[PDB]
Amino acid sequence: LPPGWEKAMSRSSGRVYYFNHITNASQWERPSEPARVRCSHLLVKHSQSRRPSSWRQEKITRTKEEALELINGYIQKIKSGEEDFESLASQFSDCSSAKARGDLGAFSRGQMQKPFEDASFALRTGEMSGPVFTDSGIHIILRTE
């Protein structure tokens, strides 16, 4: 397997899948580093976030557990094709990048919070992470270049 990936077994089906403990991504297909990447994100903040406040809500009171439930709902809508990542990042991200469909622009290593950085550089272009935890909250990250 490439670095970051491990073979796992579905608890519900018993089918093999693959999990990346860098990006928290999982996929059924067997998976077979750049100087800069470009990513978008959707952040859901919580009461333990470094700054519990955003453009959406002046005082963020949700628990980490409630923030992760929101994150998982958006992942399910995006992966089902019901909603596009851009649409949900514009509507629901607690980051001011929401105004740009979640886009952060391009960045090299050394610039972002480490968990966010490591997930971003470990994604393939077009790939979306699982829930990624930083001091700011929980992110879904889409690598766009």
Domain ranges of the chain: 1-31, 36-145
| Coil/strand/helix, residue 37 | strand
With a CB cutoff of 8 Å and minimum separation 6, the contacts of 145 are 37, 38, 106, 125
CB 10 within 8 A of CB 116: no
Give resolution in angstroms.
1.6
> What class is the 36-145 domain?
alpha beta
Classified as helix, coil or strand, 119 is helix
Residues forming the active site: 41, 95, 113, 136, 139
Angle between helix 85-92 and helix 64-80 axes, rounded to 10 deg: 150
Fold classified for 1-31: Ubiquitin Ligase Nedd4; Chain: W; (2.20.70)
Sorted by sequence, the CB contacts under 8 Å of residue 110 that are 6+ apart come out as: none
Structural determination approach: X-ray
